[PDB]
From Swiss-Prot, chain A:
The gene is PAL1. It is an enzyme of class 4 (lyase). Changing residue 158 to A: No loss of activity. Belongs to the PAL/histidase family. Its EC number is 4.3.1.24. It is found in: Cytoplasm. It comes from Petroselinum crispum. Pathway: Phenylpropanoid metabolism; trans-cinnamate biosynthesis; trans-cinnamate from L-phenylalanine: step 1/1. This is Phenylalanine ammonia-lyase 1. The lineage of its organism: Eukaryota, Viridiplantae, Streptophyta, Embryophyta, Tracheophyta. Its main location: cytoplasm. One of its GO terms (cellular component) is cytoplasm. Gene3D superfamilies: Fumarase/aspartase (Central domain), Fumarase/aspartase (N-terminal domain), Phenylalanine ammonia-lyase 1, domain 3. This is a key enzyme of plant metabolism catalyzing the first reaction in the biosynthesis from L-phenylalanine of a wide variety of natural products based on the phenylpropane skeleton. (E)-cinnamate binds at residues 208, 282, 288, 318, 390, 418, 421. It catalyses: L-phenylalanine = (E)-cinnamate + NH4(+).
């Protein structure tokens, strides 16, 4: 049972983890065949069709219902009206070039949704027309649709109808970008019957509906679901390289707020950190409150996904042909409010994920906040000639600012339209387009951040190795200069100085008298001299008399030693292996560093940060980040660590 | 099978929205709000904010004492620090007057949520302090909190702690509005033992939390839920008086989209229309025909936002947590009020969409091009030249809608990196709750105006049916008398088809459609009358002048007699609203509140009648007639027939 | 008397706006843009961005050399540092394709402003570098810059410097679109001597500045200024075809508010209407009657924004400045592009207001309730059931207006504290310029659609006057023939008063108003005809059937003959647009572009005709007919008469 208003079935689709939903979406996306029957279309199938060998097939089980309502319209009744309908809706503007044309991917999404939302049998259109649109998809012959003109999608959908009917102004684009007439398009696509002459109701069936707004919203939500998981995992890698306290993911904290999005985000981060070799070694809000921040954004993206998946399996033309009751049912299912509402809400959530990413990036490159990493994550021997990610950090502010502007809603700008017949209207596709632009900016930020984290990973590797070399050298010199002499007792304290000091505060000039290493090593020898008692009053047992000798020997030896150790690390033979290799997050570093050839950035080379960003951004846009992202979590059993 | 609690979250969304609202109203009216840290509802927050009594569950006392003792024992293993904490957080500004002070209702909401989110036993504060705040609630002694100063709620919450510690600048307001010193507030509340001296963690436990933002979000969502049901029912009443075709609510249409908000909205409207005397007696524009599609998603958003806030008001949101079971303090981020900021921005957008639909429907209703025979402006008097009806209210409705669309913009995209960049993300929850609260008040202005408009339209349909019956009787009598014949049925067809408010203010005017079309009917009959027309005794054309003279002599006095009889409570035909499922709302507005039919023949202005409904609405008096209009609904759509 | 330069700023605002636009158009069309650091106009930026040649003023060479030498001499009192600067600022992302690349036109605009803001001699960069960028402009070799990455323009400007230094990732696009390496770009441009090796301050001089944001703001403002004049003139053409009362432009009304934008707007519209054959042959709703009040402030904002940007494109905006006269470098903040962010946010709001007025006027024009006899949807064909005219375009106009209102939101209220909090305020100028550019494109979509709509309406008035003359001639002839008498003048009064598009598609239909009201006229005359009516030979009523049979036999063929004669270029009455001051715009759209009258009797869609005007508009071909329509105006309002 008894679920008469369908709240219960809706609620059941919101059970289980978000991650498991994303895993399912990815497996669906990679299937070779999209089979349409009017009721099983997912956003991942829309995304598959809009991107790339994937083919569409129509279920033969749907044919009888489609033929029933098509036959009914013909029996309930020359063609001039459907010809006029398409003519006057062809009111869009293309101009020259592509700036005012709906993108290729989005047109294919619209075509797929358009077919699926006519298969239920209530629309009164011939199955043969659905088969023609299916051929246009499978042969990658794409009608040209205007970008604007809809308040949600009569005007843009009429250019699909105009191709099917061979209007003289109709155009399509071939697989390689050639502009085609409708005759050429039919022949390349395998539509052999000549142009369609629209029967009554068929024009309305084609142009009435929300397929353009809901098709682009599907593409948007497929990417937004994956980027949410990427933001969760990158929060954990950020925590790793920042050396943050992992207790911020403790399950008790998140259990006590009940919010499931927050509980999952914390458990995912806790999984990354529980298998981290960096943790085996308070924080500011962008680290410590990242699960609280991300949780509601994930819940909104997930709810929005469910709204759009219902919309792309709905019957949204008018009137409906009800052969069972022998009548047409007039209504308003063309009103695309689920699209506008879900896209406005999702856009605000994307902006919040981007704002967190900006704040995390900002902590990461700031030497006041990043626990010993170099300012700007600079990588070369000479900080005066390496400003690291400073330009990228400026770019990240520009991304975040424009993202916050894009977060404003579209659906509060409704005009009373069409001689005030359409005195409310959804603006669904306009909102989908703005959320799509927001997703692209989030990809720019995710790319820049991810390359930043890999730089930070390599800097921690450099840090561990150079610190070991400084310790060894200080120990060598201390043994040589202070040995039996009362000065052999402060070797352990000299080493504690090295363990306590930040390598990157001095390693570019380790023996400079104005840097903390030499100063604090001298301070330690002075402190031991002051506690040396009467032994200090003898020039043979004086620690103070050893200072100048100690500093000369360190100056003669430490720079060459640091440089040898660094040359060795740059040749792939470090004394201490890179700890990322033993971390659960390794797949993402390995993909970025090895598979894509992204380079450690240093002012000693000519390579700019953007040249490396390009490699990650292009891979990200092809979905190549999906596999290493999921691989970092593949040993997670879907539960938080016990707190009892 | 539910380790991340998605499953229990989903189960909260399985009933109908109406059943949730019914349950909320029942809870709101209970005399006692018992707090245990786990069962707080927006209904209980709304009840405290608006002789309800608060009681603390004794089952919480043990856990609360454990963490309190734990903190004190970990000291010997703090006093000046907690005094300083409250001092430097007292950084708000009140000025003179009330414009920069948090409202009385919102402060009580905040205090109640503050108690509840400390009862789980993880906050390390003495139970005695919770009992003192409970006394301030039950005696209606309310500390003065600044309106602004929080990015979500250290600064405002420190003025609660300042009362409890007796800071010299602390002030409270008693039940009748008198300003009290902390000493006077303690005495009136019955709080014995003198001012509290905060133990370690106690200052933090009081100021660290989202209680101000979430308390106000609870008040806002209680009203949003009820106003959403009002919008669904008013959409059906609108359809009733517009003579809309009820087909737009047919369950097949909405079933085929699967959206549950839309299916419920349509089923509620279908229920109203299915028991409507107007429908039983008998395309449309989008604000009528697409109203289920339009409201559906807004209801889903408001419902989902409600669940988020109900989780937040039962959360532990201070820091650090005291886990006695593991002998440690757990540092974390639970003070980050993101669920408040997100749900309030989303709800405010949904509120703006409900108002835009209301504006569109009101605009159709007052426009004689669109309202199927109703007078322009819903003018009510005999003389349309001296009665512009709702024209002023329609301009006001546009101003309400415009400002509501402005308020729909989000707050949470304006985050500053704050507190020496330590708070480099922050939720802005209370700021968002305050903007959504303003949006709700504007929606009540619009709902008040629209609802009085609907009752005017109901009365105009009762006037229309009565005067139509009088015109038909007089035309019929004159026809039998002066036409000795087959033209009478056509003449009566003219009366049935013509809009009576197109002529009834001067029914025998030669430039109005009744006289013109009656004459056209006689002329067409004369033209098809053949050779018998060429005989003066059998000429239809030679009857026209007598017919028109007879009608002019009789029809205006009969119409005026009928109209005056209806204004005195003696209509020839009773008001059909009385047999409609929507009758409780009309009865409440018109008969219980005494809201009057608006007419230019009287001095009363539309705003005088709006006041009655607005004041009633703000005291929750609309709830009962609203729910009564749906009480026979079984919660399912009608079978598809 | 002007030590802070307010006075010279004010003097720039003293002429009329139209004279400024005229001057801008003249400048835009000059063959040479000579740069001297002081005279750059938005017209010159727009010309370079869209065989114009750039030349550098030799008078700047001395000052430029002085600061260049000064920097080199202060070194011996830098190479690796300037190489690093360009490397780390190359932090943008292009991906594949063009979506993340700054447009070709905007890049050329940026390069031109970059040269100009270095010619004052305070930037310490070699003149030779400025000459190289000039070669890239004059040979149309254009470096590839990222679209995003600036808060205003280090990152994008570093890709200009990267071309000049030959960085390995640098790319440029040649005149035909070929991607070039820096070596290939130097050869095609004729830049000899090899890649530049930046001296100290030279890397900073290139990347430190507001040239990308201000260059694009100049392009945007050039179009905004022209579109503002188009909106004023289209408001008058709208008034012409609506048969609006020209009183709304009376100078007393606008003089009494003192706002100069409104006074000019009204005077321009009054000038069009004063030379209108439609007006000479012969209240309104707000989009007509308040259009001067509505446009006035938008023009003032666009004008003031133009002056701000023209100052910015002639400013020195790098840092530090080299003041050889005082032997020192002056550190400061001139890279802060606040004038760009502020003027672009303000202009974008004003653009949205112009579009909202355009949408309101278009909505009146296609609505037969409001457009004073024009067909619903401006349908053009014989059969209204098979011709829905501009209904699709009207829905599109709503989508344009909605998105424009979204874009009206500001960018500059979203400032992040950036660059390790060193840039804790930043202008966001280029981001704002890009949003205002998008708003301008949408306004061109709306202006194209509205203007083709206006020409359709013009042609419908020409059809209406001709068919009205034919109906009057046929009714008059039939009347003289069958009525042997005084009724003829009343019968002709019916034709003069009735809207011909209410019946002309089937003029003898008994359910259309022409036949109905002609019959009513005869019946009223028969009724006042007295005893002579009672005689069959002198009965007006006995003439009706003959009259109607005669009219039915003759009127449809005469109407069709008249209509076909008009479609062949042989109207009985010529199109009155030909005697109107607005004729250049109609002649350009209809005759020079071959935009066609839209009709459901033909296959052509409205978008096919919009394309012609949109493409023409984007190439500046509307400018001449727009200005020609006002060429006889003396710049003053008409005397108050």
């Amino acid at each position: 049972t008894e679920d008469p208003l369908y709240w219960g079935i809706a609620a059941e689709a919101m059970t289980g983890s978000h991650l498991d939903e994303v895993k399912k979406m990815v497996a669906e996306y990679r299937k070779p065949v999209v089979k349409l029957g009017g009721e099983t279309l997912t956003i991942s199938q829309v995304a598959a069709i809009s991107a790339r060998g994937v083919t569409v097939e129509l279920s033969e089980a749907a044919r009888a219902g489609v033929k029933a309502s098509s036959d009914w319209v013909m029996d309930s009744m020359g063609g001039a009206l459907q010809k006029e309908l398409i003519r006057f809706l062809n009111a869009g503007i293309f101009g020259n070039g592509s700036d005012n044309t709906l993108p290729h991917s989005a047109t294919r999404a619209a075509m797929l949704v358009r077919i699926n939302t006519l298969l239920q049998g209530y629309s009164g259109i011939r199955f043969e027309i659905l088969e023609a649109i299916t051929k246009f998809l499978n042969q990658n012959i794409t009608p040209c649709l205007p970008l604007r003109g809809t308040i949600t999608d009569l005007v843009p959908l009429s250019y699909i109808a105009g191709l099917l009917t061979g209007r003289p102004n109709s155009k399509a684009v071939g697989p390689t970008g050639v502009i085609l007439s409708p005759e050429e398009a039919f022949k390349l696509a395998g539509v052999e019957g000549g142009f369609f002459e629209l029967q009554p109701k068929e024009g309305l069936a084609l142009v009435n509906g929300t397929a353009v707004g809901s098709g682009m919203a599907s593409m948007v939500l497929f990417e937004a679901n994956i980027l949410a998981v990427l933001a969760e995992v990158m929060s954990a890698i950020f925590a790793e390289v920042m050396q943050g306290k992992p207790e911020f993911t403790d399950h008790l904290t998140h259990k006590l707020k009940h919010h499931p999005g927050q509980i999952e985000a914390a458990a995912i981060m806790e999984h990354i950190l529980d298998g981290s070799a960096y943790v085996k070694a308070q924080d500011r809000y962008a680290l410590r409150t990242s699960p609280q921040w991300l949780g509601p954004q994930i819940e909104v993206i997930r709810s929005s996904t469910k709204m759009i998946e219902r919309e792309i399996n709905s019957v949204n033309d008018n009137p409906l042909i009800d052969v069972s009751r022998n009548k047409a049912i007039h209504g308003g299912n063309f009103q695309g409010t689920p699209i506008g509402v879900s896209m406005d809400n999702t856009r605000l959530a994307i902006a919040a994920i981007g704002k967190l990413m900006f704040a995390q990036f900002s902590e990461l490159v700031n030497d006041f906040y990043n626990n010993g990493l170099p300012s700007n994550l600079s990588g070369g021997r000479n900080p005066s000639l390496d400003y690291g990610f400073k330009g990228a950090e400026i770019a990240m502010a520009s991304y975040c600012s424009e993202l916050q502007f894009l977060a404003n809603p579209v659906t509060n700008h409704v005009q009373s339209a069409e001689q005030h017949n359409q005195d409310v209207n959804s603006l669904g596709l306009i909102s989908s387009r703005k959320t799509s632009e927001a997703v692209e900016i989030l990809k720019l930020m995710s790319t820049t951040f991810l390359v930043g984290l890999c730089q930070a990973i390599d800097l921690r590797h450099l840090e561990e190795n150079l610190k070991s070399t400084v310790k060894n050298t200080v120990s060598s010199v201390a043994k040589r200069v202070l040995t039996l002499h009362p000065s052999r007792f402060c070797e352990k304290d000299l080493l504690r100085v090295v363990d306590r000091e930040y390598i990157f505060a001095y390693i570019d000039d380790p023996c400079s008298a104005t840097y903390p290493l030499m100063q604090k090593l001298r301070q330690t020898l002075v402190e031991h001299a002051l506690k040396n008692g009467d032994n200090e009053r003898n020039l043979s047992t004086s620690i103070f008399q050893k200072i100048a000798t100690f500093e000369d020997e360190l100056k003669a030896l430490l720079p060459k030693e640091v440089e040898s150790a660094r040359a060795a690390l740059e040749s792939g033979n470090p004394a201490i292996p890179n700890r990322i290799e033993e971390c659960r997050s390794y797949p993402l570093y390995k993909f970025v560093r090895k598979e894509l050839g992204t380079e450690y950035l240093t002012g000693e080379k000519v390579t700019s940060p953007g040249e490396e960003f390009e490699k990650v951004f292009i891979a990200m846009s092809k979905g190549e980040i999906i596999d290493p992202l999921l691989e970092s979590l593949e040993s997670w059993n879907g539960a938080p660590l016990p707190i009892s």
